[PDB]
Design a protein around this ligand. Structure first.
Ligand SMILES: [Ca+2]
Ligand SMILES: [Ca+2]
Ligand SMILES: [Ca+2]
Ligand SMILES: [Ca+2]
Ligand SMILES: [Mn+2]
Ligand SMILES: [Mn+2]
Ligand SMILES: [Mn+2]
Ligand SMILES: [Mn+2]
Lengths: 237, 232, 232, 237
């Protein structure tokens, strides 16, 4: 199986598999069942911003999700990611819809990682920033249903021509370049990511959610990972 | 008094004022008596790197110090800096020598702060000019002909003097919190070369963040690392 | 006098002092009489973005100014900043109104300078604090709520006043060049909102780089864009 | 064929293909016959640094190669790269040896590209920085003889176990992610690249050279590109 660490923006409470009973954000380490969650006062139709950060010293993976004009939801979880993830990962966004649906539209996404090893000055680094997405985002690995639309947005899950979300969709976008997040001599590794996202839905209870995730580089959408498993895991273990 | 948060690289154990009894790195929050420390296996005469990180979501200030080929030392401390520091600060490096001495040479120093929403401030020196107009040099701090920042006095032959204190603040105030940023974060790194003729060098060097008008407190020499007026 | 290099977004032709006869962007080196200009199809009431860059290897200072959905205006001029500016500078935005007027509202401003192979400075404001401690506001410049930098005076409803001059300098000096640097470069962008009820708005705004102690020169009102004491 | 733009550090004068009669740096636009050259006081055995910059408003591609105790050499070329390169490219370093040889060791390599538009927020940025190269650099595409060695260096051309450069070698390393180097509606696109390199040679006249280059994303070492073609071009046209 893949090895996944993710920050989930989980619209739909699958109490069935451990979600809290409300939309929430969560930090997922090798399981869809979040190690930590926070209630998320999700607002459809309004652009949200997620900022996710980690450094290997603090070993604290944190996420905050906010919309202008509203209180942010924060969740953090202490985890030494280097003991969970391989040295090389890819980073990506995933989203699914299921029986209930929503757009999982990413309007921008940036990411910066640094890997500082003891014997070198400066920290290898990788940064990418998209304030919009091309038609052909050659630097993204689009998995599943993910595509970019006319408007320059990355629709992780299928939307119609007019942008209306489809059910039972799963899509991910990984940044093309593997990211080096640890190494034998590493002193400190960190990464920060932000994305903005627009979740719209005609459903009164939208689903399923959007994640930023980090994975083995050859990560692919697991079989059976649709819907509540957020395109990340093959089961709800 | 100033409001100080610092990561100290404390070479000299003043067990007196609650240092652990070995060189250590520490997170200091409004006191020289670190809120968290970790044994620092110093390597006098070798270039060290320190990296210090915080973000307001994680609320964990951490530092790691390392040398080439060496195991690192880390220390972290849960702290919400927005409850501690004013929203505008200056960041700086400080160092002292005391009865024992050491060079407190900073070879490089970078800092990035973000207040996201995305104000950012980043500087990086891999060398310091003779006249570093973007530093506020306080106390004994100078830059030398190598473009190194000598936080404490060293003789013309690079020999460190005792009873020295010096700091260098970055010139621009840093906006580290604001009533509506969603997250504020900063990271700092510096490389330093502590050499000493002494069996147990002293006293230490720090990266610190302070009220913008921070200045070396009177009495802050030696074990007070140029940061605090007393050991409270 | 100060030493000024500037990219001017000059709304108002003062052909008397060598403006071309249309709104134009310009590269000014030590004189309001731009060394190079390009026609600027202003779009009053629309947010514009200006990107200015320079690299000491290319020795070309360039600026482009665009509004969303419209063709950009670009102007470049070969210049060796190290023969023009002191090595330490402050960078800033200036703007003026004179007989005619416009808002010179800066909504965001970022800047990055590097000296390789040594220094970097970067700052970015997506909004400006009510009290931007890291800006030196000169003349009439203020920040409003809405978090904008109003370089020139606007009424409490935001209507621009004439005969205003305002500048904002980033607080830290920037080491814009240095003799042993292999490359010096910098990049700046700002977005601005010029609105005016005048059918011939004026006068303009600039991003400029100056000796660190630069101040609004006397008589630099209006067509002098807050940068120069005369039109030489 | 590939579309190549490169800054060559050309140790070896192939005057038969228009090289000047001395080591030189050059800006190559779709040809090994550089559009502009500058005499390069190559400092064998010393680490050099190259800085390359371009931006589409200035439209000047420039490079400086310096060492810490002689050269600078600078070369620039006015070129609108949106008219030369595809909008998506990979960026890389290449180097070759021929009959004569030299190490083409890269000690560090950084690159930043931006596509800027109507915000202080890039429409896109890509930055990477390697101050050392891992033994399995998953974010590099190593082509030809390029490998990383045990010192953390990227040896673009073959070096023996003793570190002795071999002749007839070509190697390139591309950053893994395509870079959107321009785009129809970007207001400004720019890139900067820096790398440090160490050319050592036991030859009286080391050869052949090393480049930083930008190419179609699917660029490969042209057959017939060894030696004076620097791994970039299929011929000397
Ligand atoms: Ca769920
Ligand atoms: Ca002590
Ligand atoms: Ca004018
Ligand atoms: Ca040649
Ligand atoms: Mn969940
Ligand atoms: Mn201590
Ligand atoms: Mn003018
Ligand atoms: Mn050549």
């Amino acid at each position: 199986a893949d090895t996944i660490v993710a920050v989930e923006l989980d619209s739909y409470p699958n109490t069935d598999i451990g979600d809290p009973s409300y939309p929430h954000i969560g930090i997922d380490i090798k399981s869809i069942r979040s190690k930590s969650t926070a209630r998320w006062n999700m607002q459809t139709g309004k652009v949200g911003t997620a900022h996710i950060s980690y450094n290997s010293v603090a070993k604290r993976l944190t996420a905050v999700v906010s919309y202008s004009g509203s209180s942010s939801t924060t969740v953090s979880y202490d985890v030494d990611l280097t003991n969970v993830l391989p040295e090389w990962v890819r980073v990506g966004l995933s989203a699914t819809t299921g029986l209930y649906k929503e757009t999982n539209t990413i309007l921008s996404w940036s990411f910066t990682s640094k890997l500082k090893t003891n014997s070198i000055a400066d920290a290898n680094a990788l940064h990418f920033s998209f304030n919009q997405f091309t038609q052909n985002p050659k630097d993204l690995i689009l998995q599943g249903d993910a595509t970019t639309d006319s408007d320059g947005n990355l629709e992780l899950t299928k939307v119609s021509s007019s942008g209306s979300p489809q059910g039972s969709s799963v899509g991910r976008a990984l940044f093309y370049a593997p990211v080096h997040i640890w190494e034998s001599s590493a002193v400190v590794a960190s990464f920060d990511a932000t994305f903005t996202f627009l979740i719209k839905s005609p459903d009164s209870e939208p689903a399923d959610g959007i994640t930023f995730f980090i994975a083995n580089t050859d990560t692919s959408i697991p079989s059976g990972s649709s819907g509540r498993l957020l395109g990340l895991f093959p089961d709800a273990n």
